Amino acid sequence: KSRGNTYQPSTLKRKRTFGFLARAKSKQGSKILKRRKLKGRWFLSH
Amino acid sequence: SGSYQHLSNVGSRVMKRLGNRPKNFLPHSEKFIKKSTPEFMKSDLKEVDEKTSFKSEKEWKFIPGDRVVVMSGASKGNIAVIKSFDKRTNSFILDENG
Amino acid sequence: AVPKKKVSHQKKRQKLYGPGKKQLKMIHHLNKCPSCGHYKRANTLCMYCVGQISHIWKTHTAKEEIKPRQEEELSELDQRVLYPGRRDTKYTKDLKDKDNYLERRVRTLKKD
Amino acid sequence: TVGIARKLSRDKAHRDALLKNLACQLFQHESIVSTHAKCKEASRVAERIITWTKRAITTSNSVAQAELKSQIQSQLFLAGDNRKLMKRLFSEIAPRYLERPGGYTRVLRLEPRANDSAPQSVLELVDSPVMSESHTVNRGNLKMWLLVKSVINDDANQLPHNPLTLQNLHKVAKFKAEAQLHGEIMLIKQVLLKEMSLPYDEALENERTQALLKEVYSSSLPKKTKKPSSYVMVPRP
Amino acid sequence: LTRPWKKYRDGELFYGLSKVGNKRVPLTTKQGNKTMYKGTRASGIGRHTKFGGYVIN
Amino acid sequence: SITIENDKLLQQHIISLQQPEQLASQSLLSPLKREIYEANCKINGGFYKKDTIVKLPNSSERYKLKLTKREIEVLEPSVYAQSYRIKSSMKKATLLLRLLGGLDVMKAISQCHFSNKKIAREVAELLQKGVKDGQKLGLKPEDLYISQIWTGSDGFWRKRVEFKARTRIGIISHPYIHVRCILRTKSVTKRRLAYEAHLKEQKRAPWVQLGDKPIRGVTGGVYKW
Amino acid sequence: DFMSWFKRKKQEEHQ
RNA sequence: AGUAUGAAAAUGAUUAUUUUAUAAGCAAUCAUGAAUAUAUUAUAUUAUAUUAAUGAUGUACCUUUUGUAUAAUGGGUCAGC
RNA sequence: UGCUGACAUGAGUAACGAAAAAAAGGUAUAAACCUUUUCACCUAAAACAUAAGGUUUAACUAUAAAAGUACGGCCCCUAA
RNA sequence: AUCAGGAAAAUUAAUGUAUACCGUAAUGUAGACCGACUCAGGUAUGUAAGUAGAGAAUAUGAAGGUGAAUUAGAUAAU
RNA sequence: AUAUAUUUAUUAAUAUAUUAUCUAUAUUAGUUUAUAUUUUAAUUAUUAUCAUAGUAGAU
Ligand SMILES: [Mg+2]
Ligand SMILES: [Mg+2]
Ligand SMILES: [Mg+2]
Ligand SMILES: [Mg+2]
Ligand SMILES: [Mg+2]
Ligand SMILES: [Mg+2]
Ligand SMILES: [Mg+2]
Ligand SMILES: [Mg+2]
Ligand SMILES: [Mg+2]
Ligand SMILES: [Mg+2]
Ligand SMILES: [Mg+2]
Ligand SMILES: [Mg+2]
Ligand SMILES: [Mg+2]
Ligand SMILES: [Mg+2]
Ligand SMILES: [Mg+2]
Ligand SMILES: [Mg+2]
Ligand SMILES: [Mg+2]
Ligand SMILES: [Mg+2]
Ligand SMILES: [Mg+2]
Ligand SMILES: [Mg+2]
Ligand SMILES: [Mg+2]
Ligand SMILES: [Mg+2]
Ligand SMILES: [Mg+2]
Ligand SMILES: [Mg+2]
Ligand SMILES: [Mg+2]
Ligand SMILES: [Mg+2]
Ligand SMILES: [Mg+2]
Ligand SMILES: [Mg+2]
Ligand SMILES: [Mg+2]
Ligand SMILES: [Mg+2]
Ligand SMILES: [Mg+2]
Ligand SMILES: [Mg+2]
Ligand SMILES: [Mg+2]
Ligand SMILES: [Mg+2]
Ligand SMILES: [Mg+2]
């Protein structure tokens, strides 16, 4: 069938997988946040 | 103008960026502000910020209510009494003789 | 298909403005309205006069507006306490501003 | 299916309903405005209906009367504001044309609409009443209103009336009586003068209308003179 | 016609100014599944009950 | 009450922030040159001519003004009209501006009134404003005619993306233009042009059957006859 | 500013 | 993505001079009439500039090739890099 | 098939995306907005009441009202 | 019938209850979400008048909602 | 049943005109109908729309 609609929004999954805690509660996510801070990004995670 | 913005401090980062514009780009905003106000509203002096505004009497060499002579202008040689400060361009406003 | 070279200024201008069918025609068929000496189109009516007669019809056949008694005999304080004001959104503000997207017809010239 | 009537880019049902509605609205009101093609089609339909009702009144054959009445009903939407249209037709509209042989309507052209340049026109019934039970203007008779306005204009400018104005007056007067036409002209003059902000003198306008209608209804063959007719009608040698 | 003063397609949206934007802004009470509860620091008053109620301290 | 038009001081303020309402001959010439030019035109029938010793009133001195054709064109009465930001294209404006070529302003206004094109309303408004402008300048509207009329892009056209099918793309521009006009007088410009055309006609050489057509080609250094 | 001048002129007129 | 200025080109409309509705191809060079414009030594039988009367000659430019007008490659145009 | 910017040609060409609309009045302002009537279309929906989602887009700033018995969440309890 | 069918938090007495917080608009076979578009695509539930039928098929349509950023003519070849 | 006009010191029969043929209870929980009860709440002639032009015989 047709393609293009790969993003199916759901706040629960959005926050659980790309939220701030989802990254601050691990080694790798903490590194992502730290790298984004160093680059100076305004928005670290959803 | 219905905003409710006067009740909360939202978008602090953006507000600070707008309020702390770099000094070297100030003419960019000065141009739009000037060209977007009527003649009876605008003044021919550069708006100043806090770090250079005169905040003390010693900085304000003159205080409203004292006679002064005006020169280098259309009213050169006229004696007038400064009616008040400006607080926006660090200037004075005289009486009708000015 | 697809053009093979950019068409010259000459070719484009002669293709568009060359032929006489593509050219607007001087309107010769104008004459004088009998009800008013102004210009009008031949075998056509005059809009000023037609609209004037229609306006007369409107003023003489308009249905009386409906003003309910309970409302027309209601005090200003009660009107204020029952039917307070409200803020109009940008859409309704623009919609109410009507003289910026509606044009009235323009009177023609007096033919002498 | 080709050559009978305009299609108007509409299916059969939608076209027929459109024409029914246009005819019903023309009967309900007295003059309506719409695109030229729709005006022409609705004119055809309305004139056919008026002819059927005239026949229904005139015939003495009960079968024909009943069938004609049924057909008249068949071509109408008797609902809403037009629920008593059948009675209105048989009581008011049909009697107006008991002696006119066709041509119950007229289509007058108007400048195209600015939005899309679609030609516009006024579809109107001939010889509509100008006054109501209370002697106030009714809708319709736009042609009479324009004719009387032209007469006022000529009177104000102190110029003789035009041949076409007089011809149109003659056309209207053909199916009307002197006194009733006089009264209609007087009321129209009153309203038009009050609108145009010109003084209205009852005696002077009486005299002017009387002279105009005398010229209309009188007999006088000399219409000034024609050209010396550079061609002769000599017989064959 | 959505807006009677625009007869032709010019880029204006059904509503608003832009269809896109930042989505990493903090959440609030109006957004989330029925299970989402953020709160407004307005009630630390008492104890929830084992059944669902709430007893004020 | 008081209105803008009634307020006299306000109008003088407006005309101070712009230039005074007066014709080119009155605005661009020194007083003496103006007197010489006006007297020359009066003696010559309403327009300048190359060589005519002009006599100045209440004085015994005579002059002979000398001008370039640019000066001749610019000193004759004329009115300049500009439109506002019109939503259309140059290709659309030209269709009507080529009809309104050199017509009298009244005729052009009628044509715009009875045209089928959306641009006609704005063009007619501009022409009526120009007629009023000429009346203010001192010109009779029955004398004005459309010497020049043209259209130009007004700038800052807005571009937008068009999303075709199968990933394909396009760019849609929303063009705005402006229409400008220069109206002149049949009693000065056209008469002067007729005079010049008459002079050219009188200057035109006659056709001689056995004309002295020059023998083209170099001589060669020898007699060929 | 013009605001202050206008205000004090209103007050002066009232006085 | 500073400010001011901006007769920079590509591009559009209009006007002016000139040629053009029996004539056929890189649109140019030379030969040669004619119209127009300017010229404070045109004394003129003058000079210069603009312009498809007419005649002759003339197979875009780079790249890559033994070799290209080639119907082999690259280029819608201009400004900046 | 250099990069960016501006502007051209195709060209005022193709298109304007399943569709019923007509008068009178608001308004001598209207095909496109509002009202009334006529006509149609969806009707185990193009209706009603909701979940998720979303630039509040709504009948809006004077704005979406809960002790619970048809109130959900919150809270107790746990599955993956 | 076999295809053998979730986990987890215990009663009477005596006092006791001033009842916190958050959702609530509209859209939701869509112009208000996912599809670069006011995209004929994708998108979870319940009710879904009556007549007729075995039926939630098919015809109608009582209430409700709607009739659309394109219009008016013409209807050649195709 | 309303509105204009009377047959006595609201109103009866007419001239007509306008509007309507409803609602509400019972028959064990809900929806439909069916019949009772309540109410003025009707049975003949034409017409139209929708179903591929709804359908078949012509033209
Ligand atoms: Mg994507
Ligand atoms: Mg996951
Ligand atoms: Mg069509
Ligand atoms: Mg038929
Ligand atoms: Mg979206
Ligand atoms: Mg939500
Ligand atoms: Mg610019
Ligand atoms: Mg497409
Ligand atoms: Mg383009
Ligand atoms: Mg020739
Ligand atoms: Mg050729
Ligand atoms: Mg090779
Ligand atoms: Mg070769
Ligand atoms: Mg080739
Ligand atoms: Mg090549
Ligand atoms: Mg190429
Ligand atoms: Mg084409
Ligand atoms: Mg075509
Ligand atoms: Mg097309
Ligand atoms: Mg209207
Ligand atoms: Mg179905
Ligand atoms: Mg059903
Ligand atoms: Mg809904
Ligand atoms: Mg609750
Ligand atoms: Mg909701
Ligand atoms: Mg709700
Ligand atoms: Mg796609
Ligand atoms: Mg869709
Ligand atoms: Mg069905
Ligand atoms: Mg219905
Ligand atoms: Mg809906
Ligand atoms: Mg559409
Ligand atoms: Mg067709
Ligand atoms: Mg249907
Ligand atoms: Mg059908």
> d(Cα E25, Cα E37) in Å, to the nearest integer?
17
In terms of Cα–Cα distance, which of D147, D166, D162 is closest to D214? Answer: D166
Residue C46, annotated ligand binder? yes
> Where do the H-state alpha helices sit in chain D?
12-28, 36-58, 62-74, 85-88, 142-157, 163-173, 178-196, 202-217
Residue C26, annotated ligand binder? no
Residues 25-84 of chain B sitting with CB below 7 angstroms of strand H: 25, 27-28, 31
Q: Cα of E5 to ligand 31 centre, how many Å?
A: 24
Assigned token pair, F133: 């402008």
The nearest alpha carbon in chain B to G3 belongs to: B41
Q: Cα of D19 to ligand 3 centre, how many Å?
A: 18
Helix axes D163-173, D142-157, angle to 10 degrees: 140
Strand partners, F86: F177
> d(Cα D48, Cα D72) in Å, to the nearest integer?
9
Residue C85, annotated ligand binder? no
CB E32 within 8 A of CB A14: no
Q: Is D122 exposed, middle or buried (0-12, 13-18, 19+ CB in 10 A)?
A: buried
Q: Is the CB of D12 under 7 A from strand K?
A: yes
> d(Cα F182, Cα F188) in Å, to the nearest integer?
14
Assigned token pair, D127: 């010889």
In terms of Cα–Cα distance, which of F219, F126, F144 is closest to F188? Answer: F144
> d(Cα B84, Cα B62) in Å, to the nearest integer?
10
Are chains E and A touching, using the cut-off of 8 Å on CB pairs and a minimum of 3 such pairs? yes
Q: One-letter amino acid identity for D44?
A: R
SS3 D34: strand
| D/F interface, count of CB pairs below 8 Å | 4
- Which pairing describes strands F62-63 and B67-70: parallel, antiparallel, or unpaired? unpaired
> d(Cα D151, Cα F85) in Å, to the nearest integer?
45
> d(Cα C91, Cα E2) in Å, to the nearest integer?
10
C101–chain E nearest CA distance, Å: 6
Contacts of A36 (CB under 8 A, 6+ apart): A44
Strand partners, F184: F78, F145
Q: What is the separation, in whole angstroms, between the first and last Cα of chain B?
A: 37
> d(Cα F13, Cα F7) in Å, to the nearest integer?
10
SS3 C1: coil
Instruction: Identify the sign of the CA torsion D173, D179, D183, D189.
Output: positive
Q: One-letter amino acid identity for F27?
A: S
What are the chain E neighbours of A15 within 8 Å (beta carbons)? 27
DSSP string for residues in chain F: ---TTT-HHHHHHHHHHS--S--HHHHHS-HHHHHHHHHHHHHHTSS--SS--EE-TTS--EE-----HHHHHHHS-EEEEE---EES-HHHHHHHHTTSSS-BHHHHHHHHHT-SSTHHHHHHHHHHHHHHHHHHHT--TTTEEEEEEEEEE-S--EEEEEE-STT-EEEEEE-EEEEEEEEEETTTHHHHHHHHHHHHHHHSPP--TT------S---SS---
Q: Is D20 exposed, middle or buried (0-12, 13-18, 19+ CB in 10 A)?
A: middle
Assigned token pair, A34: 């730290």
> d(Cα C83, Cα D210) in Å, to the nearest integer?
60
**Residue matched to tokens 């009586």:** D177
CA of C9 to C1' of H27 (A): 15
**Residue matched to tokens 């305009």:** D6
Q: Cα of E30 to ligand 6 centre, how many Å?
A: 6
Sheet holding D120-125, edge to edge: D31-35, D120-125, D105-110
Q: Do D137 and C57 touch (CB under 8 A)?
A: yes
What are the chain E neighbours of C94 within 8 Å (beta carbons)? 3, 5
Assigned token pair, A1: 């069938």
Q: Three-class SS string for F156-169? A: CCEEEEEECCCCCE
Strand J nucleotides below 7 A of a protein CB? 17-24, 31-38, 41-42, 68-75
Q: Cα of F171 to ligand 8 centre, how many Å?
A: 13
- Count Cβ atoms below 10 Å from residue C22 Cβ, excluding itself: 10
Question: How many Cα atoms within 13 Å fall on the side-chain side of residue F106?
Answer: 11
Q: Is D154 exposed, middle or buried (0-12, 13-18, 19+ CB in 10 A)?
A: middle
